[PDB]
Each structure stands twice: as C-alpha cells, then as structure tokens.
C-alpha cells in the first residue's frame, strides 16, 4: 500500500505544510526552487575581469618612470617611426 | 609559553578524518612524513593506504588557431593520503591546524580534513 506516502504526509503535517500529492510534471517547480539558477553561478558572470582602474593605475605607473611597460615602449617606438615616416 | 587555561566548555573531536591530496609523490611523501612526525610528537596514531590517481584528462587542439589533426594531452593527478586522527581538544586541534598551515605547500599537497563535533544536548 501507500504507507510510505502516508508516513511522509504525517511527517509533513507534523508542522503544517504540503500533504496531498501533485502531478508528475509539477516537480519542475520544486527542482527549480531547491537549487540556484545558472546565471548566478561563478562560471558565468565572473568571466571578464575589470582591468579598468587597474589599467589606469598601470598607465600612471608607466608615466611615473619607476615602472615601465615594455610593450608600450615598443608601441611608442613604432609611433615615433610612423611620425617620422607618416606623417 | 602560557597555558591560558580557562573554565569554559570546549568541543571534543570524535574521530578526526583527515585526507591529503597531492599530485606528485615526493611532495606528498614529505608532507606525510612531517604530519606523522607532528602527530607522534603530539601522541596520536595514523593509518595510510595505496589509492590510485584521478584521471581527469582534458584534450584540446594542438595549434592555437587552425589545424585539428593532432590534439594535446593535459591532465592532473592526485593521490589520497589518509592520516585520520582520534580524540583531540579543540585548542589542540586549532594549534595543530595552525602549525600545519603556517607552511602548507601551495597548490600541491592539498589537505582535506573532516571534523566531527558533538554539540552538547539541551
């Protein structure tokens, strides 16, 4: 018989909540409410780091002299070459 | 070097299940030897085993752009080193964890300790 379901209903009624059964396809609501969504997972929104204020600080450091950017040094060399041969 | 013993109730760990994960064998052996030495100095027994690795290989294309003929083999390893303890005060366990973490090998030799408290009843 349905003694397992009866005991489950009793355990639920011990505090006041659901008791009667429902449809089979209705379990999607419980499956969704019992777990978190995918958009809130760290493997989605936490994809691209900012690097905005960090890049600005790095540029200020480059302009300070104590720290230099080799790639930006090559870029400045190429810019000088273009200004001498451009333009 | 002061005991600083008070009179408040403390927690007692019931069967402290410990497990250390690590890729290579040399670092794992060094870590397990250090842990066994520390336990013997504290006064606790241990037990080890010989488990296999964890083949979680992930293959991808060889060249960064075109070409897909040959792929590349990349995977990480891990050997479980069980060193579960038994019976130890909360303060002693905290000091043990502090001493173990003050020099834990970064990356390699990952610890996986599982505590089991009791919490007094009403």
């Amino acid at each position: 018989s349905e003694y397992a379901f009866r005991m489950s209903r009793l355990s639920a009624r011990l505090f006041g909540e659901v008791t009667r059964p429902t449809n089979s396809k209705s379990m999607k609501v419980v499956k969704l409410f019992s777990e978190l969504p995918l958009a809130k997972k760290k493997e989605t929104y936490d994809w691209y780091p900012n690097h905005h204020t960090y890049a600005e600080l790095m540029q200020t450091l480059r302009f300070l002299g104590l720290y230099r950017d080799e790639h930006q040094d090559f870029m400045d060399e190429q810019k000088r070459l273009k200004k001498l041969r451009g333009k | 070097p002061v005991v600083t013993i008070s009179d408040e109730p403390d927690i007692l760990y019931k069967r402290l299940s410990v497990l250390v994960k690590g890729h290579d064998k040399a670092v794992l052996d060094s870590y397990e030897y250090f842990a066994v030495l520390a336990a013997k100095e504290l006064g606790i027994s241990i037990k080890v085993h010989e488990p296999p690795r964890k083949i979680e290989r992930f293959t991808l294309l060889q060249s960064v752009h075109i070409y897909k003929k040959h792929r590349v083999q990349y995977e990480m390893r891990t050997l479980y080193r069980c060193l579960e303890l038994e019976h130890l005060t909360g303060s002693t366990a905290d000091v043990y964890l502090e001493y173990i973490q003050r020099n834990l090998p970064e990356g390699v030799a990952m610890e996986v300790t599982k505590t089991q408290l009791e919490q007094l009843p009403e």
Binding site: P49 | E56, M110
Partner: protein, 132 residues
C-alpha cells in the same frame, strides 16, 4: 616543426640559462614548478584569477627590474602574499635596489591590499648551463 619551449639548435655557442635550458615536458622529470596555486587541482576553484595575477606580477617585476634578472622568476604563495624568488643581476647600486623594493612593496600593498613581499638573490654573472 613544433617549437614550444624547446629551443632549436643552431650553433654550440648559445649562452642559455638553467631554467631556459629545459624542455616543456620535464615538469615531472627534470624541471620543477615555478608558480603554484590550488587552482590546478582535481578540483579546486581559484585558478583563473591566480594565473592572471601571476602573469601580471611576472611582467611587473621584470619591468621594474630592466635587465637585472639573471633568469625567469619563481613565484610562491604563503598566506595573503606572493613570494617571488628572483636571481637578481648585480647592475644598480644596493641603495637603489632597496629603494625600488620598498617602493614596489608599498605600492602593491596599497593597490591590491596584499603585501607581495619578494626575495632577491644577487648574482653578477648569468647562470649559463648549456651552449645550445
């Protein structure tokens, strides 16, 4: 012809350093591990951020020390820090070295809120290991 980290031979007169004179597959045989972090486990999070921070700090220390590096760096992790073991090349004066080290330490501490204290190893001549 694949040419990852292994250097192609041309003449027996290539003053290559120790770390640079090692194939990229000897990580479990001859070559060790430079940087280390739990991100490369099976399986723990905190991997992308750690790799980005390591790749950034490497270039940062290489730029702050232009030519004063005998070889690549060897990052580490002990607490809320990131020890950097480097084989500095005796180029500038010790006063300038100390000043730059202190400035970089203070800047990193006030920027990332993480005291990335580094370590030096002054060596005049580069550690040549092979003549590829």
């Amino acid at each position: 012809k694949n040419r990852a980290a292994r250097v192609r031979v041309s003449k027996g007169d290539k003053p290559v350093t120790y770390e640079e004179a090692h194939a990229p597959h000897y990580i479990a045989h001859r070559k060790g591990w430079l940087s280390l972090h739990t991100g490369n486990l099976d399986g723990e999070d905190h991997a992308a951020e750690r790799t980005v921070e390591d790749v950034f700090l490497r270039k940062f220390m290489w730029g702050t020390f232009p030519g004063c590096l005998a070889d690549q760096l060897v990052l580490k992790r002990r607490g809320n820090q990131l020890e950097i073991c480097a084989v500095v090349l005796r180029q500038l004066s010790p006063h300038k070295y100390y000043f730059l080290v202190g400035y970089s330490e203070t800047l990193l501490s006030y920027f990332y809120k993480c005291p990335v204290r580094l370590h030096l190893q002054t060596v005049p001549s580069k550690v040549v290991y092979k003549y590829l």
